[PDB]
Amino acid sequence: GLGGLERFCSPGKGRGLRALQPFQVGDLLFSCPAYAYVLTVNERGNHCEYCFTRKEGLSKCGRCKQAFYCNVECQKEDWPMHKLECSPMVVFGENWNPSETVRLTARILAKQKIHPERTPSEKLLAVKEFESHLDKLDNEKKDLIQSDIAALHHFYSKHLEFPDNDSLVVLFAQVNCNGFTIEDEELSHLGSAIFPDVALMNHSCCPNVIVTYKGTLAEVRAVQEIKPGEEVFTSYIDLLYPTEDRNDRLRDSYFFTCECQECTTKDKDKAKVEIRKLSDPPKAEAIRDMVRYARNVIEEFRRAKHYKSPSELLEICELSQEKMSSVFEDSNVYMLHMMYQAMGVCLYMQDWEGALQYGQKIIKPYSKHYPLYSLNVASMWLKLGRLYMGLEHKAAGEKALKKAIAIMEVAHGKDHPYISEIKQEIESH
Ligand SMILES: O=C(NCCCN1CCCC1)c1cncc(-c2ccccc2N2CCN(CCc3c[nH]c4ccccc34)CC2)c1
Ligand SMILES: C[S@@+](CC[C@H](N)C(=O)[O-])C[C@H]1O[C@@H](n2cnc3c(N)ncnc32)[C@H](O)[C@@H]1O
Ligand code: NA
Ligand code: NA
Ligand SMILES: [Zn+2]
Ligand SMILES: [Zn+2]
Ligand SMILES: [Zn+2]
Known part of the structure; x- marks a missing residue:
């Protein structure tokens, strides 16, 4: 058994991990050497x-x-x-x-x-x-x-x-x-692994920890204050999406419904699906119908990237945004998904300007939609910084890289090989 923590019976959550000592924001709870792992073919x-x-x-x-x-x-x-x-x-x-x-x-x-x-x-x-x-x-x-x-x-x-x-x-x-997927500093797929002690932790849409990787080693760090007796909850899914979407992912992948503060309360839901303040406001059925189109185009794109061209994909991205904009605000998570998808295509195509354009539009709403310390946010800032620096925007690059470092110091730790390489990027420019 790990020092400072314990395995326990979490009511209506099977087995979980509980704190026996207090952990502060950015504190390493434990590290788990990979039991089995594999590097992704690409x-x-x-x-x-x-x-x-x-x-x-x-x-x-x-x-x-x-x-x-x-x-x-x-x-x-x-x-x-x-x-x-x-x-x-x-x-x-x-x-x-x-x-x-x-x-x-x-x-x-x-x-x-x-x-x-x-x-x-x-x-x-x-x-x-x-x-x-x-x-x-x-x-x-x-x-x-x-x-x-x-x-x-x-x-x-x-x-x-x-x-x-x-x-x-x-x-x-x-x-x-x-099973765990291992991602790098830009949340890019590296491989898959088995971290038995890390898989003992249950889910929350407001986790108190973040799992990061240092080679094949998994590290667990507090992103909220953990007090003795409190359970240690990590997120299993993308925390950007509203309650229903999150719970549809949880039920399909992990056969449970989350009852956390975020899911019970549904407080962040309205902010998430931001609607255009029109002189003639949109109808409740018009909102319900656009969310249906949004959840649908998201799936169509998941397929279309296996069989459509880079420019055919950017067209879906632009066309769907154009349709949604009538009902939805730019900060709406569904808009933000199509923007994230388009930035991904530009980055694939090595079109650094276009990637930087979508990046700039995404970042601020994306910042407020995720928890304080988020891998998704840290990676968006990092991409943004690396693009700015690339295109020789040294002042803006330095600012975005210093933001990515601030989150990463909590989740990855001050001493992480990723943070030393970003610090090296700022000093080379
Ligand atoms: O790391 C990931 N997510 C965040 C943390 C998750 N934490 C929760 C508890 C422990 C790990 C991650 C994301 N995507 C995929 C994987 C993954 C890696 C290796 C092997 C398999 C993987 N998936 C997991 C999900 N499953 C879909 C649902 C599923 C459950 N039973 C089934 C039986 C048959 C077909 C489908 C299913 C497909 C295979 C991992
Ligand atoms: C990787 S395991 C976590 C440890 C697990 N509780 C056990 O005892 O094996 C993931 C499973 O835990 C359960 N679980 C995790 N978080 C939960 C939560 N918030 N509410 C209910 N069940 C949860 C689900 O059955 C899920 O598929
Ligand atoms: Na995302
Ligand atoms: Na890049
Ligand atoms: Zn060989
Ligand atoms: Zn929840
Ligand atoms: Zn080696």
Whole structure:
């Protein structure tokens, strides 16, 4: 068990984490070494496969030529996990396409054969003790696990001895309910992992902690004062959206409805869906209908980026904003989503000016919509600072980077490798 905290039975929330000592804003509650983890395929070559160090000139794996390390020591240390994919990647060639979840579950099973004893990642909660919601799964979900089990057998049959299909369906349900995505300082996808003690914490739309990553290590820091006896709540979802949206995400992904202060009260809901103060105000049915269009275009875009062109996507972004603007104010979260999506396309296209334009429009409303310390906000300021600096706007860049640093010092810590690199960006300009 972790010092200063304890595992407990949270009424109507199963098992949780409770404080035994007071924690102040920016205080490290605990750190959890990754139990199992995997670097995302598009990040290969950018980051070391073993320690997740983003560094220039990484050593390639002579065999597969698709795994990169700091040195030979990272390579030897990652071999027990890398051997699950080394030869399969070359023997399957381009037929090699397991999903990140399948990839992660192959490594959970591998860690289980190698180290069946409780790991330093499980001082409070064990992988085997994970909640699965097996009895709550629909047909869509059960079919996804069945295609994942199929792919697990198809690609990882060489080194693993598999349990029955009932044990594999339970495991996949646990990974999908307790799995973590690792993001960088710009909230960009790096990989997926298993942090058992971090998964003991329950959800709140007003969390008292923020999870950050330092390589493959998860760090938990207070973003609100925590007093002895208080439960330690972290957010599972994006805190920008109104109550209904948040709870629709929670029920689909984690099979529960949140009763937190934000969800009970619904106080921040009206601010979130800001309506245009028109001389002829919009009707309640007109509002209900625009929120339906907004929730719909959001889904259409999630698909359209897999099959439409960069400029076809910016057109959706502009066209939907233009439609919504009649009823909705610029600060409305639905407008803000389409703006965020468009800034993402400009950043992809390497159109730094266009990205900076949408950035400038997003930032202020986005600031007030999220909690005081937010990874989303810190990343928006960071993007904005990096663009300003890029386009040689040194005064504005310095201001946005100093804002990103202020939040990041609380959530990541003053001593973080990300903050030292941002500080280095301000001193190089
Ligand atoms: O880190 C993430 N979010 C914030 C913290 C979450 N904290 C809550 C408790 C512990 C972790 C994160 C975001 N997106 C995806 C993942 C993820 C990473 C690795 C493996 C699987 C992952 N997801 C999780 C969500 N699931 C959808 C719902 C789902 C549950 N049971 C199912 C069974 C079959 C199909 C679908 C489902 C799809 C797979 C993680
Ligand atoms: C990663 S686990 C957290 C630890 C979990 N309570 C346990 O005992 O295994 C996530 C699950 O905890 C439950 N949970 C988390 N936050 C909750 C909340 N605010 N209200 C109700 N259930 C919650 C849900 O069943 C959810 O799928
Ligand atoms: Na967002
Ligand atoms: Na950038
Ligand atoms: Zn390394
Ligand atoms: Zn290799
Ligand atoms: Zn809530």
